[PDB]
């Protein structure tokens with residue numbers, strides 16, 4: 032359960048400032064390691080963030096065309112693995128291309144989505160020896176990924192909380208006659224929420240509720256009485272205001288999100304390949 | 311490494327266990343799926359009757375898990391002929407097992423490998439469920455499991471009939487079998503095959519009908535058995551009071567839904583009745 | 597010693613979840629898929645899935661990092 036999970040206790044952070052501090056610390060520590068091994072070849076933390084976003088959408092695309100069909104929980108677990116790994120690690124030390132595949136592999140194992148290694152690497156659009164080399168790299172990096180996650184492998188996704196909220200709305204909120212028409216749009220918002228850092232800053236229940244309520248606002252249905260009466264937050268004004276500003280922060284995070292640009296990721300990809308050419 | 315290895319403790323199909331300084335280390339598919347299962351499940355669980363995962367580490371595709379070191383298990387206590395199992399001792403073991411199982415089921419996890427050797431005892435008499443390599447999360451409407459779980463002597467009849475979807479009943483039936491083994495000092499239903507396990511179950515407890523199992527015929531591997539009367543519970547357990555017999559009947563109900571849960575079992579009169587459970591420090595050590 | 601049952605005290609940081617056996621009485625089960633006869637035969641009921649979904653929906657809703 033989330034309320035006593037490792038995700039809540041260790042991987043839910045107070046602010047975007049904390050996340051930026053962790054990422055900058057990772058980048059600077061790699062810079063120190065590299066200068067100790069021996070500069071425009073280095074990547075700045077914002078460039079690392081842009082590349083991490085590009086490869087998170089690459090991981091999404093890989094998981095979306097994966098045969099046999101990947102359960103959405105596995106995809107969420109893999110994306111959370113990617114985010115957690117690159118919170119405390121630099122793309123210039125561990126290439127995101129291999130790390131995203133290792134995240135998918137570990138997630139498939141953890142979420143009991145039993146898939147053989149040959150059929151896992153057959154989804155890769157590479158040569159047979161290319162897929163074999165990719166499998167070798169995935170097996171090399173699996174233990175590293177597990178160690179960097181601090182052996183916290185269960186990831187609580189917002190999908191089951193979303194379904195539970197839909198059940199609760201269908202049962203206890205007759206004013207909203209059909210919660211089902213709130214699904215797709217909320218799911219859309221869910222995806223957008225997954226693109227940002229909200230998964231490291233908020234609970235899955237809060238994320239699901241924010242997606243549902245944004246969907247309700249888009250359709251024009253204002254149903255604050257669900258929070259006030261059904262969840263009985265009119266009995267606790269502080270909790271109601273806290274929930275409302277959490278959702279407002281969610282929506283602000285989604286609105287100010289910036290997708291990576293093609294030419295920018297091209298330049299950063301050349302820089303990353305140069306960094307991975309030698310140290 | 312960080313741990314001073316001390317003494318060999320055993321070997322398995324997935325890993326080997328050694329005592330070190332006190333902890334016990336269980337040391338192209340990649341990292342073993344069973345070890346990953348144990349790690350992922352025991353990181354999210356924290357209860358005095360569940361084995362604690364203290365640390366984990368490894369190298370390449372090989373991995374090791376660190377657990378608290380346990381003195382004995384229920385199998386050794388049961389098989390010890392110099393250990394008199396008083397009703398208080400049995401109640402204490404049952405209570406600790408059921409509290410651990412209630413915590414586990416609350417967090418929607420089935421152990422699925424309950425047996426006397428998977429219930430470890432430490433030097434303080436605290437029973438902990440261990441060997442979570444078969445444990446799995448339940449309650450989802452699509453996570454189709456396999457019926458080849460639980461050791462055969464402790465497998466529930468619904469599993470033996472090929473149930474894909476199941477609940478806490480698979481653990482509760484194993485708990486009933488463990489209680490029967492505790493009372494009789496021998497395995498309750500020692501079959502040599504799945505068919506023989508079902509035959510022993512129906513010979514001892516009677517062949518269930520639709521009165522006690524409304525949809526038994528829908529299970530894919532269900533086979534009609536001969537109608538046995540079943541040996542009455544007070545015949546099998548001649549030293550068991552009425553409350554203990556009620557608990558046994560609840561644990562051995564053929565209907566998995568009607569089978570008592572860990573919470574319902576803990577609320578039964580048997581646990582609140584005289585005598586009270588033996589304190590952990592006073593339990594017998596083999 | 598005697599023994600007295602005490603329910604487990606686990607803070608969920610969210611709205612109260614109705615008890616399992618009350619779900620059908622409260623109308624929740626009318627919005628979850630009915631269990632197949634094999635499902636009930638093995639012990640799986642729609643109430644389990646509904647209760648798990650509600651517990652995940654309400655877990656940590658009021659919690660702040």
Ligand SMILES: CC(C)c1cnn2c(NCc3ccccc3)cc(N[C@@H]3CCNC3)nc12
Pocket residue numbers: 319320321322327334335336361377378379380381382383386430440441
């Ligand atoms: C959690 C686990 C890793 C563990 C903790 N303690 N422990 C011990 N302690 C000594 C003992 C325990 C019970 C009876 C007799 C002796 C032995 C042991 N080995 C068996 C050999 C095949 N696997 C299990 N595994 C463990």
